[PDB]
């Protein structure tokens, strides 16, 4: 069997109509996916699916970046790809000319990450396993073979990664049973989009708690008076026991961030996400030093494992977000999860975007089983949008993610959805733009 085509689609959803996903930095995002399919000449079931998440404009550029990887992947043996995902990833990340466009950051790296993710989807499908089990059931040797240890020898070596993975082997099966029976903790951000009225914020916050979520997140960062008012209203709506996180989406400078949080601390903050630039490691550390013990996090825009290494080394975070589509695919997220485990820093996956809940749940679950054995101390983000467009939509029960069962990364989208929302010739857009 061989990969006979790399198909790409520019799919965009009009989330801006109701300001779903709105925040202090992105006031009107249109959740989009640079969707990719690795087609094979095997069974219709044998294909890999993946996507890069963007928020509208630029999605065509992101799609073109993914399409440019066809030369590298078309013609490859499926058996060889799924048997050495490290080699598959390296063919792309070690292309020095593509590295120049990054290296390992921005559009070109996310495009590479989507194709790598599609390869893991293909591997899991071939193994007839949901991705989280596929990953968690690989041997420690197989797992480290997929990781790029360059630039990490000062923090995580192959031998050190092997040790962590081997330490978990005895409890892998038991943890798998626990996850299947109990699900994984989740928190929701849907009640907190910044573009919503105070009335809507309160209504949704209450519905979130009524739905079983033990934690919710509010967007902040544009106006301190608005933030004080909204945080007070939300805290009153959810009660004193529910956790409430806030997210500034990179809006502040170091000094202003510390002063801003000084005005929100009274509302019992679970953590402040992305108080400043996603590139400012020293800055996050300075902010953390100034607002401690109020927890600081960042991660959804962290470009690669090298920056994550520094965030951990510098003590710039109390917890981190990981994102399924921001980095170099599964291979890179495995390195990031191992780094987090070694440094004893909790991971709260980001999932604010179309298909992100579907994808990232697998990484968190694989981590629980094969890496940390810890989930009750953390949570996976959840947003109540666009799940209807996926064949295997995430399922939430009493505020917890149920473990996926069908084979794959849960990335496959309904062809009808692609036909309706492809930009700009999709049925919805042709009429909307008209």
The yes or no reply on residue 105 touching ligand EHM (CB under 6 A) is: no
DSSP letter, residue 2: B
- What is the distance of C-alpha 406 from the center of its chain? 20
DSSP letter, residue 356: H
Query: Is position 247 annotated in a ligand binding site?
Result: yes
The yes or no reply on residue 247 touching Mg ion (CB under 5 A) is: yes
Rg (CA), the chain: 21
Binding mask 2-31 for ligand EHM (x = CB under 6 A): -------------------x-x--x--x--
Residue 21 binds which of a second copy, ligand EHM, Mg ion, none (CB < 5-8 A, kind-dependent)? ligand EHM
Out of 14, 42, 86, 103, the residue judged to bind a second copy by CB under 8 A? 103
DSSP letter, residue 214: S
The rounded distance, in Å, linking the Cα atoms of 414 and 11 is 12
Q: Which two tokens stand for residue 180?
A: 């299947």
What is the size of the binding site for a second copy (CB under 8 A)?
Answer: 62
Query: Is position 350 annotated in a ligand binding site?
Result: yes
The rounded distance, in Å, linking the Cα atoms of 356 and 383 is 9
Sequence length of the chain is 434
Q: How far is the CB of 363 from a second copy (least distance, A)?
A: 20
- Residue in 105, 109, 129, 219 annotated catalytic: 219
Q: Considering only CA atoms, which of 271, 333, 325 is closest in space to residue 301?
A: 325
Q: How far is the CB of 100 from ligand EHM (least distance, A)?
A: 8
Q: Is 284 a catalytic residue?
A: no
- Region from 125-133, 201-209, 327-335, 349-357 binding ligand EHM, contact rule CB under 6 A: 349-357
Q: Considering only CA atoms, which of 319, 222, 210 is closest in space to residue 272?
A: 319
The yes or no reply on residue 249 touching ligand EHM (CB under 6 A) is: yes
CB burial of 324-359 (b: ≥16 within 10 Å; e: otherwise) equals bbbbbbbbbbbbbbbbbbbbebbbbbbbbbbbbbbb
Residue closer to ligand EHM, measured from CB, 125 or 346? 346
Q: Is 219 a catalytic residue?
A: yes
Q: How far is the CB of 301 from Mg ion (least distance, A)?
A: 8
The residues annotated with a catalytic role in the active site are 219, 350
Which residues participate in the annotated binding site for substrate? 21-23, 31, 217, 249, 273, 300, 350-352, 381
Contact residues toward ligand EHM (CB under 6 A) are 21, 23, 26, 29, 189, 247, 249, 300, 350, 352-353, 381
């Amino acid at each position: 069997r061989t990969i006979i085509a790399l198909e790409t689609h520019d799919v965009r959803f009009p989330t801006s109509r109701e300001l779903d996903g709105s925040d202090a930095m992105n006031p009107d995002p249109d959740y989009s996916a640079a969707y990719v399919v690795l087609r094979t000449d095997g069974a219709e079931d044998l294909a890999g699916y993946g996507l890069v998440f963007t928020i509208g404009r630029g999605n065509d550029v992101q799609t073109a970046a993914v399409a440019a990887l066809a030369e590298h992947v078309v013609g490859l043996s499926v058996d060889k790809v799924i048997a050495d995902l490290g080699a598959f990833a390296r063919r792309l990340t070690n292309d020095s000319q593509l590295r120049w466009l990054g290296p390992e950051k921005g559009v070109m790296h996310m495009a590479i990450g989507a194709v790598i993710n599609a390869a893991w989807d293909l591997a899991a499908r071939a193994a007839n396993k949901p991705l989280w089990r596929f990953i968690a059931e690989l041997t420690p040797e197989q797992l480290v073979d997929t990781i790029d240890f360059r630039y990490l020898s000062d923090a995580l070596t192959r031998d050190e990664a092997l040790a962590i993975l081997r330490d978990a082997q005895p409890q892998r099966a038991a943890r798998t049973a626990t996850l299947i029976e109990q699900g994984y903790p989740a928190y929701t951000t849907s009640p907190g989009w910044l573009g919503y009225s105070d009335e809507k914020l309160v209504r949704l916050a209450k519905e979130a708690v009524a739905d079983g979520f033990r934690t919710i997140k509010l967007k902040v960062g544009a106006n301190v008076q608005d933030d004080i008012r909204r945080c007070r209203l939300a805290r009153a709506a959810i009660g004193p026991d529910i956790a409430m996180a806030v997210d500034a989406n990179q809006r502040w400078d170091v000094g202003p961030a510390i002063d801003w949080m000084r005005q929100l601390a009274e509302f019992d903050i679970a953590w402040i996400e992305e108080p400043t630039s996603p590139d400012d490691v020293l800055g996050h550390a300075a902010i953390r030093q100034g607002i401690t013990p109020v927890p600081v996090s960042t991660g959804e825009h962290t470009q690669n494992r090298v920056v994550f290494k520094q965030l951990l080394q510098a003590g710039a975070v109390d917890l981190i977000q990981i994102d399924a589509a921001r980095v170099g695919g599964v291979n890179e997220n495995l390195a990031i999860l191992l780094l987090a485990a070694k440094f004893g820093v909790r991971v709260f996956p980001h999932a604010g975007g179309v298909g992100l809940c579907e994808l990232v749940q697998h990484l968190a679950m694989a981590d629980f089983v094969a890496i940390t054995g810890k989930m009750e101390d953390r949570a996976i983000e959840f947003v109540d949008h666009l799940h209807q467009h996926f064949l295997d939509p995430v399922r939430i029960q009493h505020g917890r993610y149920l473990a996926p069962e069908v084979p794959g990364f849960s990335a496959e989208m309904h062809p009808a959805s692609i036909a309706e929302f492809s930009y700009p010739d999709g049925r919805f857009w042709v009429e909307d733009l008209a």
